[PDB]
Short mmCIF file of C-alpha atoms and ligand atoms in Angstrom, two decimals:
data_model
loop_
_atom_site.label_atom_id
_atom_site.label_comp_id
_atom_site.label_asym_id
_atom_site.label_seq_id
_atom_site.Cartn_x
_atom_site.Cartn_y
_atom_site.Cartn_z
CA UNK A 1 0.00 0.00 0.00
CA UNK A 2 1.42 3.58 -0.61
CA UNK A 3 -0.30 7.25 -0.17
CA UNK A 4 -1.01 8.35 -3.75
CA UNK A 5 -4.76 8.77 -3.70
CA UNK A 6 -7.57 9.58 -6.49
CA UNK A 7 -5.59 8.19 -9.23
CA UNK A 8 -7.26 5.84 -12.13
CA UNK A 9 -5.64 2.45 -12.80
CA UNK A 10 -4.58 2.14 -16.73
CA UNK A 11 -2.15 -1.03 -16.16
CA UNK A 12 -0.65 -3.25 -13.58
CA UNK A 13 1.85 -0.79 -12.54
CA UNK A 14 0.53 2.71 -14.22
CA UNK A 15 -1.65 4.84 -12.62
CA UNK A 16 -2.34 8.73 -13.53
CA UNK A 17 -4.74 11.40 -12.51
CA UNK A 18 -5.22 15.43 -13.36
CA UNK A 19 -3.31 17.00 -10.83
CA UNK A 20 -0.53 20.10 -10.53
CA UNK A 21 2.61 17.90 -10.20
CA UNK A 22 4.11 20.62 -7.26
CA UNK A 23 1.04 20.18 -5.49
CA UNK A 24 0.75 16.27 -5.35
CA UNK A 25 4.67 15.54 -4.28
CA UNK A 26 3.89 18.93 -0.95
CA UNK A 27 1.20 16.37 0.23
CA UNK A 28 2.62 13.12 -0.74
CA UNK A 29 6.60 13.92 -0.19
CA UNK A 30 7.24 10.70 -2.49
CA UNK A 31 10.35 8.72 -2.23
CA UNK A 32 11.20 10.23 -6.15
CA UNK A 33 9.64 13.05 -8.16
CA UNK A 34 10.51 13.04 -11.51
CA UNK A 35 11.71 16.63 -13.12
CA UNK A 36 11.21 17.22 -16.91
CA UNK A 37 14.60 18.70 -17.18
CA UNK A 38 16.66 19.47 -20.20
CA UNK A 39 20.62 18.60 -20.51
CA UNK A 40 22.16 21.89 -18.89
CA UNK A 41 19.41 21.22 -15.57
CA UNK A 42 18.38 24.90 -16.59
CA UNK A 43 14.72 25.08 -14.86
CA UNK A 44 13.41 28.15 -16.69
CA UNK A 45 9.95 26.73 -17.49
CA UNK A 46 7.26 23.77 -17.45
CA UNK A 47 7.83 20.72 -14.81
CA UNK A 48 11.41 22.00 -14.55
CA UNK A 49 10.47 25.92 -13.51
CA UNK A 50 7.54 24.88 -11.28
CA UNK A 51 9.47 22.41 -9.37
CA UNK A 52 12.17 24.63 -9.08
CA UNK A 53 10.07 27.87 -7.95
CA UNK A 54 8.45 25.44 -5.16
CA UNK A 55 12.05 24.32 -4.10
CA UNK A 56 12.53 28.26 -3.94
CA UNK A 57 15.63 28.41 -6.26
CA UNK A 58 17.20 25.76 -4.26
CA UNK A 59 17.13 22.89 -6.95
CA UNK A 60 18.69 25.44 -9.36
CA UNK A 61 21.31 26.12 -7.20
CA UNK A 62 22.01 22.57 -6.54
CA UNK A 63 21.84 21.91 -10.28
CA UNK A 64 24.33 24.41 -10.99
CA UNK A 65 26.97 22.92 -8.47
CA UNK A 66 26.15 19.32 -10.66
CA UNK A 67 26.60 20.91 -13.90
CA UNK A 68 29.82 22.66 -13.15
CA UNK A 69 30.93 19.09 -11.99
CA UNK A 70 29.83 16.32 -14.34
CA UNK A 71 29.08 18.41 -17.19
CA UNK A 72 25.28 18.39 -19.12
CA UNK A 73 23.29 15.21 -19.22
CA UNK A 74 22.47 12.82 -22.33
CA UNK A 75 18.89 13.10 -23.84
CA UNK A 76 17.33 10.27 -22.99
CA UNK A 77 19.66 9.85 -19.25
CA UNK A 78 18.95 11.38 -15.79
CA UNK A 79 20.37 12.19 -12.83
CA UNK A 80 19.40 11.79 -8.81
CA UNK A 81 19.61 14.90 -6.53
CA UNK A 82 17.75 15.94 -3.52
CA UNK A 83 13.85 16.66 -4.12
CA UNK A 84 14.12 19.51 -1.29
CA UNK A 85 10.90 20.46 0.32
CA UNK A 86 9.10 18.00 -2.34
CA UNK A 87 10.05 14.34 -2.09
CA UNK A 88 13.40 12.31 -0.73
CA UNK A 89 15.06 12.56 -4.47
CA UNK A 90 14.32 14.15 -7.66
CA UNK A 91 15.06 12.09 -10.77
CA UNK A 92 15.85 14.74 -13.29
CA UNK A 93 14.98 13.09 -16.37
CA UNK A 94 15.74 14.86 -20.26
CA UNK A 95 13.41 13.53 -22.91
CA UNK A 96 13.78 14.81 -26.19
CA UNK A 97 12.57 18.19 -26.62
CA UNK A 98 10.45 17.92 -30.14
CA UNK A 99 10.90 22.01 -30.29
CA UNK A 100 15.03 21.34 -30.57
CA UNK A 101 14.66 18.45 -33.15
CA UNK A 102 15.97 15.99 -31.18
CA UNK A 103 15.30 11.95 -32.30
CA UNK A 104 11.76 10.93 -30.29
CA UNK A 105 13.21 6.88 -30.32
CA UNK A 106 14.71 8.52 -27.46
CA UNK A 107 12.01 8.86 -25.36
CA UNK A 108 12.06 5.09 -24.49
CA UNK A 109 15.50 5.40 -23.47
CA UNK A 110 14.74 8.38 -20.87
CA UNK A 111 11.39 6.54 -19.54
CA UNK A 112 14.26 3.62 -18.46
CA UNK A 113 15.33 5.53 -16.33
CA UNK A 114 12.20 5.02 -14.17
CA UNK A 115 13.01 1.20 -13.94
CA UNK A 116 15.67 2.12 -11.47
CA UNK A 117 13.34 3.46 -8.97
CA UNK A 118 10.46 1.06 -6.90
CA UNK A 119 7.80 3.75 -6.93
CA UNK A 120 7.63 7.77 -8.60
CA UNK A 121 5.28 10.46 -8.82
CA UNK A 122 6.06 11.99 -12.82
CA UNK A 123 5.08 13.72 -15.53
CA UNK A 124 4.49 12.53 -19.29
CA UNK A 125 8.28 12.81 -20.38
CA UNK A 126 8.44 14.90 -23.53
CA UNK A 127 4.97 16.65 -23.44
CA UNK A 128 4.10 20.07 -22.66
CA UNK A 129 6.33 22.47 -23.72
CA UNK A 130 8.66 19.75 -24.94
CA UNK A 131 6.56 19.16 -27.89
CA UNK A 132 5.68 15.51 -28.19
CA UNK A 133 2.07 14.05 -28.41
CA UNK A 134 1.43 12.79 -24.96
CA UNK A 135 -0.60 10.18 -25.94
CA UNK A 136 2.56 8.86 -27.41
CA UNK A 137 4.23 9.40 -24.67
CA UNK A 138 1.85 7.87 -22.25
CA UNK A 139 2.17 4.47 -24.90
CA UNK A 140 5.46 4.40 -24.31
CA UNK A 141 5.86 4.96 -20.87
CA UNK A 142 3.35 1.85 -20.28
CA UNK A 143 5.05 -0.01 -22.32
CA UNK A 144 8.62 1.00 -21.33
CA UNK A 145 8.21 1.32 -17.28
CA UNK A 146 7.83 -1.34 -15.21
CA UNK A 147 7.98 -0.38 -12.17
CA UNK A 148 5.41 1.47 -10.14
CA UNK A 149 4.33 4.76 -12.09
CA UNK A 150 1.98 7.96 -10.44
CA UNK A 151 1.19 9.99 -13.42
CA UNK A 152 -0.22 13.56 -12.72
CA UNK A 153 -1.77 15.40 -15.77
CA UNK A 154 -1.51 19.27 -15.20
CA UNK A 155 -4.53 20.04 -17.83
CA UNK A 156 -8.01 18.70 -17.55
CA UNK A 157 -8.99 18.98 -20.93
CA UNK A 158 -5.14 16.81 -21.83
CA UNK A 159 -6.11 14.39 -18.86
CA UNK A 160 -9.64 13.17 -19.75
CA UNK A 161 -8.74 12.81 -23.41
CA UNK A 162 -5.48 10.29 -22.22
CA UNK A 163 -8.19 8.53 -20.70
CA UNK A 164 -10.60 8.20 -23.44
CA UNK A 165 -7.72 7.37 -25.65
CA UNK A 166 -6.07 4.93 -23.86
CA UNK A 167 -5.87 1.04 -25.46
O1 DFA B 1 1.12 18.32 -17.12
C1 DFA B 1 2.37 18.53 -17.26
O2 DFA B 1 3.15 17.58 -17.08
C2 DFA B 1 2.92 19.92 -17.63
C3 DFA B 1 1.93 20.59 -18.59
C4 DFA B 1 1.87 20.18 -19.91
C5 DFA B 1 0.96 20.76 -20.78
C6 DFA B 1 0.10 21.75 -20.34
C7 DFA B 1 0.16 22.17 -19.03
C8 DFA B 1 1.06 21.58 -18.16
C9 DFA B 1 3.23 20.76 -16.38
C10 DFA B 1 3.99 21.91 -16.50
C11 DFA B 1 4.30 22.69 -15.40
C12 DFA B 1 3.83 22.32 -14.17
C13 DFA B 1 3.06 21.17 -14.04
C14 DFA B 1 2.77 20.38 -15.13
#
């Protein structure tokens, strides 16, 4: 049993529900968020700036120190910092950003990263301001995660048709 509450079942191990991302992991303080972050960890907008404004600038800052370390991320790889004043970790995850042309095979690749991780709240890698369809992205993350999977859906009108969509 965990505390995620009001979501609707779609598989085994995938579960999603219309809800501001910031707001679910302040009640729920889940054991990993998942960011939508790009390669440079540069959280000016979407998942990435809402996260980060929650976190108060603290997530950039801590970004900052891991980019002037280990250099920029791979799309399609991750990294695991602190989730602050939202979870235990945050699993900063770069899909391919549609809007940049990068190759959208690649979102399988980033949704793998999930596998390493029991439970996470996350968004739909790749949508929103990233570009992709998120029905396509929802397809692949239930066929590409296995392990256990809290979507939250920031727009109604995005959320319900997932839902009708959904095979
Ligand atoms: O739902 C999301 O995953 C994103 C999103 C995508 C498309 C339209 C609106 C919101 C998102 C962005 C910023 C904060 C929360 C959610």
């Amino acid at each position: 049993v965990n505390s995620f509450s009001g979501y609707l079942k779609l598989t085994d191990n995938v579960y999603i529900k219309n809800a501001d991302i910031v707001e679910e992991a302040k009640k729920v303080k889940p054991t990993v968020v998942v960011n939508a972050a790009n390669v440079y960890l540069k959280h000016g907008g979407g998942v990435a700036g809402a996260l980060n404004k929650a976190t108060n600038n603290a997530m950039q800052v801590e970004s900052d120190d891991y980019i002037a370390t280990n250099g920029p991320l791979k799309v399609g790889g991750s990294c695991v910092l602190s989730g602050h004043n939202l979870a235990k970790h945050c699993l900063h995850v770069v899909g391919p950003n549609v809007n940049k042309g990068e190759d959208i095979q690649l979102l399988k690749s980033a949704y793998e990263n999930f596998n390493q991780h029991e439970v996470l709240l996350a968004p739909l890698l790749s949508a929103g301001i990233f570009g992709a369809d998120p029905i396509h992205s929802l397809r692949v993350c239930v066929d590409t995660v296995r392990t256990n999977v809290y979507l939250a859906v920031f727009d109604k009108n995005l959320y319900d048709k997932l839902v009708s969509s959904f095979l």
